[PDB]
Design a protein around this ligand. Sequence first.
Ligand SMILES: *[C@@H]1O[C@H](CO)[C@@H](O[C@@H]2O[C@H](CO)[C@@H](O)[C@H](O)[C@H]2NC(C)=O)[C@H](O)[C@H]1NC(C)=O
Ligand SMILES: *[C@@H]1O[C@H](CO)[C@@H](O)[C@H](O)[C@H]1NC(C)=O
Ligand SMILES: *[C@@H]1O[C@H](CO)[C@@H](O)[C@H](O)[C@H]1NC(C)=O
Ligand SMILES: *[C@@H]1O[C@H](CO)[C@@H](O)[C@H](O)[C@H]1NC(C)=O
Ligand SMILES: *[C@@H]1O[C@H](CO)[C@@H](O)[C@H](O)[C@H]1NC(C)=O
Lengths: 54, 172, 172, 172, 91
Amino acid sequence: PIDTCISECITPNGSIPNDKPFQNVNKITYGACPKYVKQNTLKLATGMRNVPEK
Amino acid sequence: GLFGAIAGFIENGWEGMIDGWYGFRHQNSEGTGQAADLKSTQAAIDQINGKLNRVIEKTNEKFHQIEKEFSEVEGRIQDLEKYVEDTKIDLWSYNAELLVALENQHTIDLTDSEMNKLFEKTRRQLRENAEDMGNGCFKIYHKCDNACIESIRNGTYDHDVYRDEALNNRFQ
Amino acid sequence: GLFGAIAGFIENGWEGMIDGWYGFRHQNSEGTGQAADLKSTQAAIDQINGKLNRVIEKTNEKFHQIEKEFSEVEGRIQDLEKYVEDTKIDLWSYNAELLVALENQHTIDLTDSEMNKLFEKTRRQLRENAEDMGNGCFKIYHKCDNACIESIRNGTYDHDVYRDEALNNRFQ
Amino acid sequence: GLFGAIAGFIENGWEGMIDGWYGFRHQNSEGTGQAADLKSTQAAIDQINGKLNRVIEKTNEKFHQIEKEFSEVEGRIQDLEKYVEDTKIDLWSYNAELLVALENQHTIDLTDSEMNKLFEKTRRQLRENAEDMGNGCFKIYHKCDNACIESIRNGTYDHDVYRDEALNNRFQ
Amino acid sequence: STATLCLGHHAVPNGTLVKTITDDQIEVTNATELVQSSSTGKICNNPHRILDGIDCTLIDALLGDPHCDVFQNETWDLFVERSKAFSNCYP
Ligand SMILES: *[C@@H]1O[C@H](CO)[C@@H](O[C@@H]2O[C@H](CO)[C@@H](O)[C@H](O)[C@H]2NC(C)=O)[C@H](O)[C@H]1NC(C)=O
Ligand SMILES: *[C@@H]1O[C@H](CO)[C@@H](O)[C@H](O)[C@H]1NC(C)=O
Ligand SMILES: *[C@@H]1O[C@H](CO)[C@@H](O)[C@H](O)[C@H]1NC(C)=O
Ligand SMILES: *[C@@H]1O[C@H](CO)[C@@H](O)[C@H](O)[C@H]1NC(C)=O
Ligand SMILES: *[C@@H]1O[C@H](CO)[C@@H](O)[C@H](O)[C@H]1NC(C)=O
């Protein structure tokens, strides 16, 4: 269903935010959309190796 | 972990450190104190803050494309469209996997290098006045009060005026 | 070879070393002995054992595709199919070339870093009792029997109880 | 800049250096002199001279392809051709961006590592006769004339015959 | 008689498992998700001129099917074609 909102990327599943570089929602896209990838998750490290006490 | 500082000869992180990423814990006659190193933390954060805008600048803008879902079965043309889309998806999935792996490896090496660089900078300030105990912690061989310690952290540690006392303490 | 340990200041490999990848050769009054360092070898092997499953997880499974060999000459559609297949082949060939080059470079840097890390760990055990001769080999300045050497290799070298004798031997 | 030599503890380049990339500036009783290190410069240049032929070997040779510019509007087949070409262009543009970023990062790390390797090699030649002042410049603790300096640069510095005088100058 | 100066880095109680060139799973202090895997389920009507086609396909609105008379002279950036669309004119 259509909605009153702002979004640059539309898939058949609705609008999605394009802040991330990749998406796993639908390979059919319209607008400034992320690229479709087969992976459901890809974590990018934004910190150091985590070595806790003990 | 190419330099063996983090998870290497430091052997332990500081959950009590919330001021920054890298810092010092000093202990002298007055008492134990802790501080964070702003320069190294800022350098590492600056090198990490982007790191994905520098390869994938942004999202390109696609408006009209081929059909990717089909109801009936046509034959050659539908096969070609399905093949093209599957090829593109596989290639971009590989690009994502490799890019994330490379960026993670470089981030880990980068933070390890920043830790090692801080250690080496500190070691070079304390030319002969201190000895590296090997667990990432320096034993300084003279009266070093809080002004002394904050001079070490500052980067203006004057090694010349403690050289005689330190050398006498070390080699007897 | 980013750290200059392998093919750098070590200058020579040991073909007589079959126990592990990195190890020690000691020489003292009793006689020359050789051993391998299991921790560094295991770390390097662990980091190498995968290294290709972490990017290309596995082979994806493709069943029905386009035709890639043609008998007659049709025109547009055959041209498009040939172009699509050639594009895919070129892109995947480039992916293979770049991936192998990057993995080889990182493997070489990784093994060099492990050698350097072992050297630095050993140097930090021998705080003031030994001097680095520069060819990757330490000169220890006291009676160091086989128990002493196996304590160095163990990582439990007690530097404090040889400090006086070693310092006297060094600085006279 | 993973090792902190260049833009790190060296802190300044030498625009007066035109002989090579890395070199020495010595100052003793006779007077200031400058020379370049040929081995490190040659190593860095050798590692840089290719660096793009090793991934993209050459240009592949393409003769007959699809049409990429269209006058009228056909529909499905033109859409597919446009999509295929746009996909190929985007994938190759990403390949170019990532490749150049990776090569630049590695080149910077490589030159930094060569500077650090030269520094460490020099430091290992001067076992106990010199002290690292921390700004990338060594203080040698004995009469060291131009023959002495050119022996340091040569790699044949005989540390044993200055050890007593240097140690006496250092520790008094 | 002597002082002591340790160096260290911050850690966190719980870390995020990422993947590198040399590790299937390695724990870091922080990590960001790179794949957008969920959707709000609704189509935002800005900045794109969306045209919801109620019961009308694009070709039916084109030909001038009676129950598509509301789509005459329409313009769109994205024509959204519903699954419930049907034809009600000459076959
Ligand atoms: C890891 O980094 C992310 C990104 O900076 C942090 O998430 C943000 O945290 C701030 C904290 O004030 C919020 O204002 C933002 O809205 C958060 N962004 C998102 C996308 O959620 C996260 O907190 C960091 N983790 C740790 C442990 O510091
Ligand atoms: C640190 O050094 C700066 C300049 O070297 C000086 O101005 C300052 O007073 C010092 N101490 C601090 C910041 O506590
Ligand atoms: C090495 O050290 C361990 C523990 O530090 C000890 O149990 C062992 O006896 C030592 N010597 C060996 C393994 O030869
Ligand atoms: C440098 O060393 C080489 C061999 O070690 C020697 O032949 C030469 O005379 C030395 N001095 C130079 C090249 O000025
Ligand atoms: C956070 O840490 C706690 C314990 O410290 C742990 O149980 C939990 O799984 C971690 N993650 C989240 C998302 O709570």
